[PDB]
Design an enzyme around this catalytic site. Structure first.
Site, PDB file in Angstrom:
ATOM      1  N   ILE A  46       0.819  -1.210   0.000  1.00  0.00           N
ATOM      2  CA  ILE A  46       0.000   0.000   0.000  1.00  0.00           C
ATOM      3  C   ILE A  46       0.856   1.265   0.000  1.00  0.00           C
ATOM      4  O   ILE A  46       0.694   2.134  -0.855  1.00  0.00           O
ATOM      5  CB  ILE A  46      -0.970  -0.005   1.200  1.00  0.00           C
ATOM      6  N   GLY A  47       1.772   1.384   0.946  1.00  0.00           N
ATOM      7  CA  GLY A  47       2.589   2.584   0.987  1.00  0.00           C
ATOM      8  C   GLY A  47       3.637   2.444   2.066  1.00  0.00           C
ATOM      9  O   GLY A  47       3.767   1.401   2.709  1.00  0.00           O
ATOM     10  N   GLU A  48       4.414   3.504   2.261  1.00  0.00           N
ATOM     11  CA  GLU A  48       5.404   3.393   3.324  1.00  0.00           C
ATOM     12  C   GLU A  48       5.682   4.764   3.908  1.00  0.00           C
ATOM     13  O   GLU A  48       5.350   5.794   3.318  1.00  0.00           O
ATOM     14  CB  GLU A  48       6.710   2.752   2.844  1.00  0.00           C
ATOM     15  N   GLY A  49       6.269   4.758   5.092  1.00  0.00           N
ATOM     16  CA  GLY A  49       6.661   6.004   5.700  1.00  0.00           C
ATOM     17  C   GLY A  49       8.094   5.965   6.166  1.00  0.00           C
ATOM     18  O   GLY A  49       8.886   5.125   5.721  1.00  0.00           O
ATOM     19  N   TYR A 106       9.594   4.949   8.831  1.00  0.00           N
ATOM     20  CA  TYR A 106      10.154   3.748   9.457  1.00  0.00           C
ATOM     21  C   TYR A 106       9.232   2.551   9.337  1.00  0.00           C
ATOM     22  O   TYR A 106       9.221   1.679  10.217  1.00  0.00           O
ATOM     23  CB  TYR A 106      10.485   3.949  10.933  1.00  0.00           C
ATOM     24  N   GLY A 107       8.467   2.470   8.256  1.00  0.00           N
ATOM     25  CA  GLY A 107       7.638   1.289   8.122  1.00  0.00           C
ATOM     26  C   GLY A 107       7.121   1.157   6.709  1.00  0.00           C
ATOM     27  O   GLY A 107       7.464   1.934   5.811  1.00  0.00           O
ATOM     28  N   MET A 108       6.280   0.145   6.538  1.00  0.00           N
ATOM     29  CA  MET A 108       5.649  -0.189   5.276  1.00  0.00           C
ATOM     30  C   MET A 108       4.295  -0.767   5.615  1.00  0.00           C
ATOM     31  O   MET A 108       4.185  -1.531   6.575  1.00  0.00           O
ATOM     32  CB  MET A 108       6.460  -1.225   4.488  1.00  0.00           C
ATOM     33  N   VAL A 109       3.281  -0.397   4.839  1.00  0.00           N
ATOM     34  CA  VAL A 109       1.915  -0.874   5.045  1.00  0.00           C
ATOM     35  C   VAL A 109       1.495  -1.716   3.842  1.00  0.00           C
ATOM     36  O   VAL A 109       1.710  -1.318   2.682  1.00  0.00           O
ATOM     37  CB  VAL A 109       0.928   0.298   5.234  1.00  0.00           C
ATOM     38  N   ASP A 139      -2.083  15.347  15.768  1.00  0.00           N
ATOM     39  CA  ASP A 139      -1.576  15.207  14.404  1.00  0.00           C
ATOM     40  C   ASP A 139      -2.698  14.935  13.428  1.00  0.00           C
ATOM     41  O   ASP A 139      -2.581  14.073  12.547  1.00  0.00           O
ATOM     42  CB  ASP A 139      -0.555  14.078  14.275  1.00  0.00           C
TER      43      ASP A 139
END
Ligand SMILES: Nc1ncnc2c1ncn2[C@@H]1O[C@H](COP(=O)(O)OP(=O)(O)NP(=O)(O)O)[C@@H](O)[C@H]1O
Ligand SMILES: *[C@@H]1[C@H](C(=O)OC(C)(C)C)C(=O)[C@@H]2C[C@@]1(C(=O)OC)CC2=C
EC number: 2.7.11.24
Length: 344
Positions: free
Chosen positions: A22-25, A27-30, A140
């Site tokens: 789906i996507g990532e940020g 420090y992670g990945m979804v 946030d």
């Protein structure tokens, strides 16, 4: 064998299979995935926070809060996967209900009708009433933290910056475009009003498909806010408890207020009345979540009897602000133990 996604290990089988990126940020990945046990589609967030204190802070806060909250407009946590020893634990996987998109992604492809804006705004505020009723600040809110599905259901997510309301924080924050002026000015920023300001910014963005205050840096962010609201009044200045910040504002040129109907000439006047009350500089004058739900703009959805509240205030049971990352990792291990075979 551990399923891999785009070269990244997702060690979540055999329960969870058929992973799709789906996507990532930072420090992670979804990924989406299938839960073979419950026979449902899920989202799985792989988080790798343990080298950084601020990332651990976000992870612990998200886990503690989302496991306590239960509300239709707030994303839940279904499961958490991690290694059986603290030394082996380098990643945490948070399993959540799968949603279809988020408002950030939607606004890039589609202009929203006034009816879509009204319903999304209602659900944001309905979720937020519950959060604030629990004495919690989300801190946030922004379009990418609002998840959507094909039924137009909306869920608030990502409580990594959340804290208890209580009238210099080291933290990881991706964007300041939605941050209330009292936060930007460092003045008693643990008021529920800071979330209402973010909702106002989100409403403005739905109205025009552009962020209202897209600052390039810290000072430019303040200049964006003042360039629309105008220079603060005397009573505005007096509610700034930080004399250094008051001094800073006083050194700026005078700016005139820009009428809402000039920025949004084709918007429903009731939406603009609400917007005006959310984007109020003085947080003591800013509309509260219950009052916002009751605003004529939302009259077709307002239903107090169906806008539930938390049974009691949320509490951390410990102060997390300045803990070292090794301590935070121990706390994350303890908080996720309940999802382990054999817990206590
Ligand atoms: N439950 C979910 N269902 C579907 N997509 C999700 C879910 N949770 C997160 N996502 C998506 O996964 C991607 C990564 O998001 P994430 O890295 O967690 O950042 P965020 O917390 O949503 N806010 P941001 O820091 O601006 O990206 C985004 O495209 C999200 O829309
Ligand atoms: C919104 C809906 C639609 O496409 O909404 C998004 C883009 C998925 C958010 C749609 O096509 C019409 C109009 C509708 C609406 O006004 O909901 C409040 C519902 C629909 C069937």
């Amino acid at each position: 064998g551990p399923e891999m996604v785009r070269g990244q290990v997702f060690d979540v089988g055999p329960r969870y299979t058929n992973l799709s990126y789906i996507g990532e940020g930072a420090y992670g990945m979804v990924c989406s995935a299938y839960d073979n046990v419950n026979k449902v589609r899920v989202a799985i967030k792989k988080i790798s926070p343990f080298e950084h204190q601020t990332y651990c802070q976000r992870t612990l806060r998200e886990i503690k809060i989302l496991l306590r909250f239960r509300h239709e407009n707030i994303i839940g946590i279904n499961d958490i996967i991690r290694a059986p020893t603290i030394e082996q634990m380098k990643d945490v996987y948070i399993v959540q209900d799968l949603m279809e998109t988020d408002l950030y992604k939607l606004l890039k492809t589609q202009h929203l009708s006034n009816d879509h804006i009204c319903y999304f705004l209602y659900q944001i505020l309905r979720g937020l009433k519950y959060i604030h009723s629990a004495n919690v600040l989300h801190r946030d809110l922004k379009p990418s933290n609002l998840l959507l599905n094909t039924t137009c259901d909306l869920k608030i997510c990502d409580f990594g910056l959340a804290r208890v309301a209580d009238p210099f924080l080291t933290e990881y924050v991706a964007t300041r475009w939605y941050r209330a002026p009292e936060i930007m000015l460092n003045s008693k920023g643990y008021t529920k009003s800071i979330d209402i300001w973010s909702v106002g910014c989100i409403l403005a963005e739905m109205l025009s498909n552009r962020p209202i205050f897209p600052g390039k840096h810290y000072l430019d962010q303040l200049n964006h806010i003042l360039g629309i609201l105008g220079s603060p009044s005397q009573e505005d200045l007096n509610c700034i408890i930080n004399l250094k910040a008051r001094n800073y504002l006083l050194s700026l040129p005078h700016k005139n207020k820009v009428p809402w109907n000039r920025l949004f000439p084709n918007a429903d006047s009731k939406a603009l009345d609400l917007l005006d009350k959310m984007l109020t500089f003085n947080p003591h004058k800013r509309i509260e979540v219950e009052q916002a739900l009751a605003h004529p703009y939302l009259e077709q959805y307002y239903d107090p009897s169906d806008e539930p509240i938390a049974e009691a205030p949320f509490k951390f049971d410990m102060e997390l602000d300045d803990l070292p990352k090794e301590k935070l990792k121990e706390l994350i291990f303890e908080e996720t133990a309940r999802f382990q075979p054999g817990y206590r």
